[PDB]
Nucleic acid binder design. Structure first.
Lengths: 82, 119
RNA sequence: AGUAUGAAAAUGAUUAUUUUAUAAGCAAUCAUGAAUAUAUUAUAUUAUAUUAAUGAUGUACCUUUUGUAUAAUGGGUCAGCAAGUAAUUAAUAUUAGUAAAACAAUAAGUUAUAAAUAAAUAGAAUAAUAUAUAUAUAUAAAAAAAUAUAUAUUU
RNA sequence: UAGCCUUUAUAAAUAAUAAUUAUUAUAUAAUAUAUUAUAUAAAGAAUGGUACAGCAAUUAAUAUAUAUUAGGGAACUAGUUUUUUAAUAAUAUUAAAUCUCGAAAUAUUUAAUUAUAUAUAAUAAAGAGUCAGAUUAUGUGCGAUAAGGUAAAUAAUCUAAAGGGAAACAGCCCAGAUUAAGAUAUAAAGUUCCUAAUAAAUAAUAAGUGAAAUAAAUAUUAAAAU
RNA sequence: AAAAAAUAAAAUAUUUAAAAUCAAAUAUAUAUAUAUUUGUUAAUAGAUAAUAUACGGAUCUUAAUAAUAAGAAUUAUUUAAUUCCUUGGAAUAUUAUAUUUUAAAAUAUAAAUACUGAAUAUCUAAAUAUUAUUAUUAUAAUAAUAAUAAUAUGGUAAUAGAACAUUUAAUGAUAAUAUAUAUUAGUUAUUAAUUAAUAUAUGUAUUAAUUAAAUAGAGAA
RNA sequence: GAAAGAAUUAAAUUAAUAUAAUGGUAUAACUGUGCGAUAAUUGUAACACAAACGAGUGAAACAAGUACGUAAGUAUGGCAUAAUGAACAAAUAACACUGAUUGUAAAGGUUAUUGAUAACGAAUAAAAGUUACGCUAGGGAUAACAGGGUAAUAUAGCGAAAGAGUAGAUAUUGUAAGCUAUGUUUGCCACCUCGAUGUCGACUCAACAUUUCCUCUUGGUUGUAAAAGCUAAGAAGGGUUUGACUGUUCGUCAAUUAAAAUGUUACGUGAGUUGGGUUAAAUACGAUGUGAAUCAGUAUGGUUCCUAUCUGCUGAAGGAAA
C-alpha cells in the first residue's frame, strides 16, 4: 500500500520547519505528485504538513515514466506517410 | 493608521464556503492517512488489499500525533465543528475575545479548529 | 582654425498619405475596423507597410532609499568626449614546459628538497604504523601536548 | 572578525533533514505471581517552569457579635465587666515582571529504523556583499493597553518578486515569469450591471441597518426563556 | 366584570444561557449502556466640521391581477436539483426534449458531474543545464546533433560561466558581376549577421578565420 | 515489664554560608573539632563549554614533590557565579640562549614579577573653548515651520446623578468617576521635502463649516403674568464694528450695533502688498564666562527678487457639425 501525496498548496507563506518537512517528504513544486510506501514514519510526517498536502491511498505505486504516460493527452490523429 | 489595510471584519459567503471545503479536505487527508496505515498493517498480518479494505475491524493508529488527530475532542471534523469555530478565532486582545479566522496570517494553510471552552 | 566629402542627429518650413473639432492622463502595447501605399506567382476572398475609429490594460527613467508616479535627485535635445589602469611585489587558481629537481647557465642567487625551536653544537623504525622515531617543555631515560617522520621504489 | 553568500574540489563518507520507535497501562494470549506477543487507551525516551492554574512559603488584601492578650469603656461590689482597639491567632476569601507546591503545547534533543540522494551535512583552496531595514501576525518592555511610535523575541513577505485578490495598494490574501501556447484542473477572491462568471434552501432584517475600512456606556422598543 | 376551558396570548420580575438540563449526533460494548460533539436575541437612538454626495459606481428590500419572464444585489446557516441511501449511489421531483396519441397525455432520453479565476499546475511545442538511457554522424571512455525520462531555469548588492560589436598587430585568398556605407523590405531564436532593391563612393578589403593588444560599447555625473 | 543503645520517620536549606542576587546546601557546602598550615605546588594538558578574534570556564590524564587520613582516599585555594587590563616601554630577577674579527663585555633574547591605560580592546609621553565674520562636504539619516501619524492634551457631546436650585436631583444648575466624538490647540512621532519664506502680525481678498451670536419657527421654564430673560429643537437665507494702547493673534477700554458667534481653508491669503515683531553682519544695556563670546533678556538700525509656460479664474474673440 502507498500514499499518493500531492503538494496542493505553495510553500511561500510557510515557516521553515514545515518547508524542511516537505523537502524531506520529497515534494518539490506545487502539484508535484509523489508515491510513498506506507509506514508510521511517513504518516507522521504527512500529518505534520496536513494543510499543504493532499494524500490518497493506493494498491500500487507508479514510477515517474508511468505517471507521464498516464498524463499524456490523446492526439486525435493517425499519421499515414506518403 | 494612515496606511489602509482594507480587510473586512467578517467573511463573505463564498469565503466561508471555501474555508469549509478546506476544513473538509484536512479531515479527508487524516482519514486517508489512517486508512493507508490500517491497510499496511492488514498486509503485514497477511491479507490482500481488497480483503484489508473489506475488514470489519479497522486498526487505529499507534503513533501519537495521528491518534490525537483522530480524536474529535482534540481535532474535530468540519461536520462536528461549531459555526463559530469555523469562522472565528480566539483573540484575547479583541473585544468579544474573538476575531475572524481570515484575519489570521496564512489562514488558508494554517489550521485552527479548537477554541477554549468558554471563549 | 588642414582639404574633400558628407540622405548623422537635434531643429525649420512645405507637401503627400492618414487620423483628428462630445473627449480628459508616461501617449505605448495588445486587440480591432477603416483608409492608403507598394507588390515581376494579389490565383485572392492575397501579403506587407503607413495610420491616435475603436476597446482593453498601462503611476517615465535614474540615483538614493525600510519604501518613489512621486510634490526626493539629474538631465532642454542631438553629436562628439568622459571613467578598475600602469609599474614594482606577495599570495591562490588553471594550463604548459621541466621534474627530486626547477630557474638561470660564466658565475651568483631564489624556491623546493625536514619538521622544528625564542636560540644553541639537537634532527626523523636499534625488529615496523604509532605502541617506532624527530624537535619543543620537562628529563636519569621515559610517560604526557602539539606537530612531524618511517607501511619494486625516494616527495 | 565572525553570521548570512559564491566558486572549485574532497571523500573511511549519510554524519545533513524529516518522521517514527523508546513509555505507562488495560484486555486477551502463551509461557515462567510472574514475562513475550497482539490489540486498545494515554498529548507516550530525557530536560525544562511559560501559559494554565494556584494561594503552599514569600509578598500583599478582606471579613468576623470568634477568641485571647493586655487594654478603650462598664454597672456595680480593684474586680467583674461592655460597646469600641490593635496586633496576633482561628476560619473563610483573593493576587504577583522580578512567588510557582500543581502544570500545557510549542520547544531542546537522544540512539536506531525509515524517506528524501538528479539530495544534505562536513571539510580544502579561494572571492564577496551586508552591519540605516520595513511592515504584518503573536507574547511582551517602554509609551497613556497613543502612534505609519519606540525596544527586542518569533513567523512571513518586502527588501531583492514579476502574477491573481484586497476599488487604488512595497510589506496583507493567494502564488513564485526559462520561451511560447492556451485545451484541461484549479488557488486567493469572486459570479445583477460597470466587470470574466450561478442557481438554490432556510431563517431574520426594513433600518438602505447593510452591500471590503463593524464606534461606546447608556435609553427605548421588541423577542425568546425561567 | 368579560375564560371551549388550556394547548396557547395575564401580570412581576429575572434571564439572554447547551456550563446545567434537554434534543440531535459520533464513538465504544451494543438491544441503547457510558464518553465526545453540536444547538440559546433583534431593531431603532446614541451618530457628531469644514473643496463634493462617495457601499469603488450604478443601484439593490417586489406587487395577485398578468408577460417565457421579477421578487436582494443585506444578514445568519447551508446545497450544487431533491430526498433517501454508502465520495459512490437508489429513488423520485423538476428541467429539457422527443414521441405518438386525446394544450394536455403517457413513454422516452439527456441531464443532473455550477461557473469565473493567476506569468500556479497539467497539457501542447521551444531553449539552456544536469542525471539517466538511448539514436546518429565522426579523453570514440570522445565529440556534434538529435531522441525519451526526470529535476531546475524571479532577482538588488555580489560570485561564477560563456558570447557578441568596435580598434590595432601577426597570418591572408578575393574583386566595381566587388567592396564599403546608408534607407527600406526581408531571413537567421535576431546586441548580431545576411539576402534583395536602391544611392554614394571606392578598381578596393589588415577582408573570413586564430591569436594577441586594447583609449574595446553611455539616457544618466 | 523496664532500662540502655542503636537509631528511624517526620520537619527543616526559613538558621547559616567571607560579601550582592540567584542557584545549591542537613548525603550537609553549614557547624564543632584534631591534625596541620601542605595542593593559596611544579612541568606537559586531551577534551569539551563558551566563542569573531584577543580572551574566558570545566577538566580526564601523565609526571615531581607536600599535606591530612586505619583505610577508601581527598587536596592544583574558598559552595558557585563579580573581585579586572592588550601590547609597547622601563625595572628587578632568573636563564645560560645568542655574543657582529676573536676573547670577555654591552645589549638582546627565554622564563619570573612589576606599576595603567575606569571613554575600562588601552589612538600620544603630552591638547579646553568660542564664532550672530564664518567656510566646505553632506543629511535631511533623524526639529523649525507646514502636511501626516496619534488624541494624553485641547474642543464638544452623551449616560448616571451626589449637590445646588425658597418647597423639588433632571425650570435652571451638575463635582469626582463613566462612555464617546473631534482632529482646531499643547504635546507626542520623525513619515514627507527637509532649495515649503509665502517666514507668526497687518492690509487685499475672501471661500467654506455650523459646533446658531443676531435675525425666523417652536417645546419647557413652583424657577413663562407682561416685558425682559433662562434653557432646548429646527434652521447657515441674510447679517455679524469703529476707535485708544499694544508687532501683536489676544486682551483691556471707549462708543456703538439686532448681533458684534466659533472655526476650517499650508495657525486661509505676496511669483499680489507691508515688513512692525521674531529675524544675519554694527551696536549698547542687565546677567553669565578667566576670556573669545553668550543670553527665552531689553534696545537703535537694518535688501528681498521673478516679463506667467501649464492648470485655474476673469473677460473677449475666431473655428466648428447645422
Amino acid at each position: 500500500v502507498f500514499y499518493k501525496v500531492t503538494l496542493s498548496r505553495s510553500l511561500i507563506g510557510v515557516p521553515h520547519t514545515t518547508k524542511s518537512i516537505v523537502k524531506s517528504l520529497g515534494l518539490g513544486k506545487r502539484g508535484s505528485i509523489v508515491y510513498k510506501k506506507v509506514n508510521p514514519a511517513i504518516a507522521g510526517s504527512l500529518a505534520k504538513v496536513k494543510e499543504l498536502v493532499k494524500v490518497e491511498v493506493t494498491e500500487h505505486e507508479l514510477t515517474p515514466s508511468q505517471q507521464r504516460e498516464l498524463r499524456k493527452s490523446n492526439p486525435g490523429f493517425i499519421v499515414e506517410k506518403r | 493608521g494612515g496606511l489602509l489595510w482594507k480587510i473586512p471584519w467578517r467573511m463573505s459567503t463564498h469565503q466561508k464556503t471555501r474555508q469549509r471545503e478546506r476544513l473538509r479536505n484536512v479531515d479527508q487527508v487524516i482519514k486517508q492517512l489512517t486508512l493507508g496505515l490500517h491497510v499496511q498493517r492488514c498486509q503485514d498480518k497477511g491479507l490482500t488489499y481488497q480483503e484489508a479494505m473489506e475488514s470489519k475491524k479497522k486498526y487505529k493508529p499507534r503513533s501519537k500525533s495521528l491518534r490525537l488527530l483522530n480524536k474529535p475532542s482534540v481535532f474535530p471534523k468540519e461536520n462536528q465543528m461549531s459555526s463559530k469555530d469555523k469562522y472565528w478565532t480566539f483573540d484575547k486582545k479583541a473585544v468579544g475575545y474573538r476575531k475572524g479566522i481570515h484575519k489570521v496570517p496564512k489562514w488558508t494553510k494554517i489550521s485552527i479548529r479548537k477554541a477554549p471552552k468558554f471563549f
